[PDB]
Amino acid sequence: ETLVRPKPELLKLLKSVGAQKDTYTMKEVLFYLGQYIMTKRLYDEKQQHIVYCSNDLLGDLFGVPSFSVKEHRKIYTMIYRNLVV
Ligand SMILES: CC(C)C1=C(C(=O)N2CCC[C@H]2C(=O)N(C)C)SC2=N[C@@](C)(c3ccc(Cl)cc3)[C@@H](c3ccc(Cl)cc3)N21
């Protein structure tokens, strides 16, 4: 009840990087989302603060083509839209 419950499309995201649970602290979520971005190589060599998720499950979930890591509010909005209420 400290924790938060992923909607199952994001929870399938988390397991494609080795996650075992189905509830999580925010930290776990942020950390797994980062696995993803760095494993699936979703970024520009030119400007590395932009993540491009255009043709990818991540983009699906967040409903965007791309977004900047410097933009937290906007990130948490995207994450929460995927949290079981
Ligand atoms: C991938 C991740 C481990 C990490 C960053 C990261 O390392 N990235 C960004 C893509 C290219 C690569 C890079 O070389 N940079 C240092 C800019 S830069 C960076 N900052 C972190 C810690 C972060 C965490 C929470 C928020 Cl709300 C925003 C940013 C965190 C993060 C976590 C979740 C998401 Cl969805 C996006 C970014 N993040």
From Swiss-Prot:
Protein name (record): E3 ubiquitin-protein ligase Mdm2
Ranges where the record places region Necessary for interaction with USP2: 1-85
Tissue-specificity statement: Ubiquitous. Isoform Mdm2-A, isoform Mdm2-B, isoform Mdm2-C, isoform Mdm2-D, isoform Mdm2-E, isoform Mdm2-F and isoform Mdm2-G are observed in a range of cancers but absent in normal tissues.
Included stretch of the parent chain: 25 to 109 of 491
Subunit structure, interactors included: Interacts with p53/TP53, TP73/p73, RBL5 and RP11. Binds specifically to RNA. Can interact with RB1, E1A-associated protein EP300 and the E2F1 transcription factor. Forms a ternary complex with p53/TP53 and WWOX. Interacts with CDKN2AIP, RFWD3, USP7, PYHIN1, and RBBP6. Interacts with ARRB1 and ARRB2. Interacts with PSMA3. Found in a trimeric complex with MDM2, MDM4 and USP2. Interacts with USP2 (via N-terminus and C-terminus). Interacts with MDM4. Part of a complex with MDM2, DAXX, RASSF1 and USP7. Part of a complex with DAXX, MDM2 and USP7. Interacts directly with DAXX and USP7. (Microbial infection) Interacts with herpes virus 8 protein v-IRF4.
Comment field on protein domains: Region I is sufficient for binding p53 and inhibiting its G1 arrest and apoptosis functions. It also binds p73 and E2F1. Region II contains most of a central acidic region required for interaction with ribosomal protein L5 and a putative C4-type zinc finger. The RING finger domain which coordinates two molecules of zinc interacts specifically with RNA whether or not zinc is present and mediates the heterooligomerization with MDM4. It is also essential for its ubiquitin ligase E3 activity toward p53 and itself.
Record's comment on post-translational modification: Phosphorylated at multiple sites near the RING domain by ATM upon DNA damage; this promotes its ubiquitination and degradation, preventing p53/TP53 degradation. Autoubiquitination leads to proteasomal degradation; resulting in p53/TP53 activation it may be regulated by SFN. Also ubiquitinated by TRIM13. ATM-phosphorylated MDM2 is ubiquitinated by the SCF(FBXO31) complex in response to genotoxic stress, promoting its degradation and p53/TP53-mediated DNA damage response. Deubiquitinated by USP2 leads to its accumulation and increases deubiquitination and degradation of p53/TP53. Deubiquitinated by USP7 leading to its stabilization.
SWIB/MDM2 domain ranges (all copies): 2-85
Top-rank taxon, per record: Eukaryota
Disulphide bridges: none
Membership in a protein family: Belongs to the MDM2/MDM4 family.
Induction cue: By DNA damage.
Biological role stated in the UniProt entry: E3 ubiquitin-protein ligase that mediates ubiquitination of p53/TP53, leading to its degradation by the proteasome. Inhibits p53/TP53- and p73/TP73-mediated cell cycle arrest and apoptosis by binding its transcriptional activation domain. Also acts as a ubiquitin ligase E3 toward itself and ARRB1. Permits the nuclear export of p53/TP53. Promotes proteasome-dependent ubiquitin-independent degradation of retinoblastoma RB1 protein. Inhibits DAXX-mediated apoptosis by inducing its ubiquitination and degradation. Component of the TRIM28/KAP1-MDM2-p53/TP53 complex involved in stabilizing p53/TP53.
Region entry Sufficient to promote the mitochondrial pathway of apoptosis, spans: 1-77
Location within or outside the cell: Nucleus, Nucleoplasm; Cytoplasm; Nucleus, Nucleolus; Nucleus
Miscellaneous section: MDM2 RING finger mutations that failed to ubiquitinate p53 in vitro did not target p53 for degradation when expressed in cells.
Disease tied to this entry: Seems to be amplified in certain tumors (including soft tissue sarcomas, osteosarcomas and gliomas). A higher frequency of splice variants lacking p53 binding domain sequences was found in late-stage and high-grade ovarian and bladder carcinomas. Four of the splice variants show loss of p53 binding.
Name of the gene this protein is made from: MDM2
UniProt lineage: Eukaryota, Metazoa, Chordata, Craniata, Vertebrata
